[PDB]
């Protein structure tokens, strides 16, 4: 089928007033527009988030502070930092309305895979997998992804988390520790000081979702070609032992090489193979944004992968759009690895595939209400 | 013969709305007010820096840009993206306050040690380093370090500029790249990508100032012992072939254990050391701060230095006050190291002593 792409001008002027990341959103759209990939994909107008939607993760404590928040902005409101706001998650004016409209974005998506309208639904405003269910935690105050997830856990009985972020998805993680509905796979850089400190290869869940978590610890540093061979050896291994009915995806641009944070050394095109891989499956698969702090960088990584779901080639070229000047000294679309080391023992990464693999065989495959 | 404190309430209620450093001035006073060491230290409340005291290095015509964002906000001003206005240094209301009162206060902290009222002069909320004369860049739109260099000049013949922040000091080696009169000295992370990417150990400065600018590119998941054996190296050659009359010295905190850029793995006390080696010369030094962005341990780093600068011990525990539910889980002054690896390898680093030592054979 044609693709879902999640947008709508006001949607994408929202997102642009995100602190962290501002003018983003208009970015990573305009970069697609300028390669008319809207063109080849069926155009969704976003939903907000309802309440009773976003509570089904968030506690309906939390969501009333960031309501207040909203309205009476900066203030040092004394019950701020009980729920994460402060440095990483800003408290001003509007973050219920950016918290509401990329959750109902997300969950939006998920109802197009539900619906059959797709096999691939887009939101690459999404991807905020920090928040807790009473608690904003990087960058963003909603966890999107889990909410996409619970929205399509309406249909689909074993669902795949991929986290490709240069961050432990830490928050999709511990929402479905417990359960084995939710596989949650994540790569990312783990190194003690590094944000958030978690997703060792030896967390694999608690109790009954206990070896329904995956996490691959991963050195600064690492390109395109080592990186493809982790993902695919974990990805088949899980595909083997999950069987996934459905895929949520989430392709934070943070490990692209420009990037500020400069820790991993990827191209989108070693991303973009980790997308084909995961696209042959042939299931329903809701495609997040994320991080991304090289902003022209990540707006050239999404566009690619854009392009990769839509199975074109595109011109090395950048065409000419409203921010073409962010684009020198170059301006193409390829990006080019940094000239420094892969902190990346190929031993070390064999071991952590080794642990992989053994966890993996404790998982079974069951269907609703065994035994 | 007490070192000077650059404060007042409205300086550090202003320095607490940087967007890049919520709260943070707040955070290092609080916890040094804690320790009282305010009260062995000569309070003096900071002037704002004029618009002339503010051309001495950057241009009128990027000054009066910065005023007029600053009365207004981001009404899409094209030529805002060209005065490095943006994500790193965001055009909202009060940027030119902001700058004219950091700047300002270490003008009044360079013209401290002018008055021979001080030998050891502080501003924390100063350190500003990338800034050049006509762009902002790297969080902040003015360079505080270049306009307290020029104010020292005023009375001594040579300035010795010490940057031990996790960047490269790129504003302030490159605004006097040309001279001999001031030589910087940047220890600093050094890896294709990182900001701002320029300082390489080949880079000497320019004409008259050749070999009068000193890089050391370091690697990621350095700890104290090894940095002060480079750092001393360094400025045990420096002093001996500059001959400095004053420093001026910028402590960012990003290089401390726990930074969430965590690159290097240093603690506040492998900091003071290089401090202490500093102060040994008993010349008239400019105290200045920079990035760090663990708020807490920037508080915990400067709390300590400072009292490194008073030769004093602090108590491990820290004590109660508007900040303190931030100091968690553990609640003392120490920050442990991570356990991280270190990426420098000593043959490298040894190579790099070397090439500096070469260069410092030109300096006379
Ligand atoms: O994309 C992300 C990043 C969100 C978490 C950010 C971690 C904290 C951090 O990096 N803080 C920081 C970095 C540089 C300067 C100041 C603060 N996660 O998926
Ligand atoms: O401390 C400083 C300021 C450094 C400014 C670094 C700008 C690049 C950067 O780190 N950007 C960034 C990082 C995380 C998230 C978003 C942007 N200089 O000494
Ligand atoms: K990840
Ligand atoms: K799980
Ligand atoms: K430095
Ligand atoms: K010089
Ligand atoms: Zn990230
Ligand atoms: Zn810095």
């Known amino acids: ?11 994408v002027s ?27 994909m069926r155009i969704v107008k976003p939903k907000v988030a309802s309440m009773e939607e976003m509570a089904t993760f968030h506690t309906d404590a939390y969501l009333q502070h960031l309501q207040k928040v909203s309205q009476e902005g900066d203030d040092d409101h004394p019950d701020s930092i009980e729920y994460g706001l402060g440095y990483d998650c800003p408290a001003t004016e509007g973050i219920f309305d950016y918290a509401a409209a990329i959750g109902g974005a997300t969950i939006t998506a998920a109802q ?22 009473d608690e904003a935690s990087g960058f963003f105050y909603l966890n999107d992804a889990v909410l996409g997830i619970l929205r399509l856990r309406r249909k689909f009985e074993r669902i795949l988390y991929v986290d490709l972020d240069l961050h432990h998805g830490d928050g999709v993680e511990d929402a479905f520790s417990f359960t084995s509905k939710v596989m949650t796979v994540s790569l990312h850089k783990f190194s003690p000081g590094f944000f958030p400190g978690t997703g060792d290869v030896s967390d694999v869940g608690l109790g009954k979702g206990r070896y329904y978590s995956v996490n691959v610890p991963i050195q600064d540093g690492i390109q ?56 042959q499956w042939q299931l329903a698969t809701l495609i997040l944004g994320g991080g991304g702090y090289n902003l022209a960088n990540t707006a050239r990584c999404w566009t690619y992968l854009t392009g990769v779901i839509l199975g074109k080639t595109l011109s090395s070229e950048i065409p000419d759009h409203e921010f073409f000047t962010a684009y020198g000294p ?10 420094r080391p892969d902190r990346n023992e190929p031993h070390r990464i064999q071991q952590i595939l080794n642990y992989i693999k053994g966890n993996l065989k404790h998982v079974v495959i069951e269907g609703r209400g065994s035994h």
């Open 112 to 133: 197009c895979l539900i619906d059959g309208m797709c096999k691939v639904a887009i939101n690459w405003s999404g991807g905020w997998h920090h928040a807790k269910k």
């Open 224 to 279: 395109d070609e080592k990186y493809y061979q982790i993902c695919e050896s974990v990805l088949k291994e899980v595909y083997q032992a999950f069987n996934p009915k459905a895929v949520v995806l989430q392709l934070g641009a943070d490990t692209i090489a420009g990037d500020p944070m400069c820790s991993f050394n990827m191209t989108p095109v070693g991303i973009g193979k980790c997308l084909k891989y995961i696209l």
């Open 330 to 339: 170059d301006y193409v679309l390829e990006i080019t690895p940094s000239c």
């Open 14 to 40: 929202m997102c642009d007033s995100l602190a962290k990341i501002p003018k983003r959103a208009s970015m990573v759209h305009s970069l697609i527009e300028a390669y008319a990939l809207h063109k080849q």
């Open 1 to 11: 089928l044609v693709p879902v792409y999640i947008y709508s001008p006001e949607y």
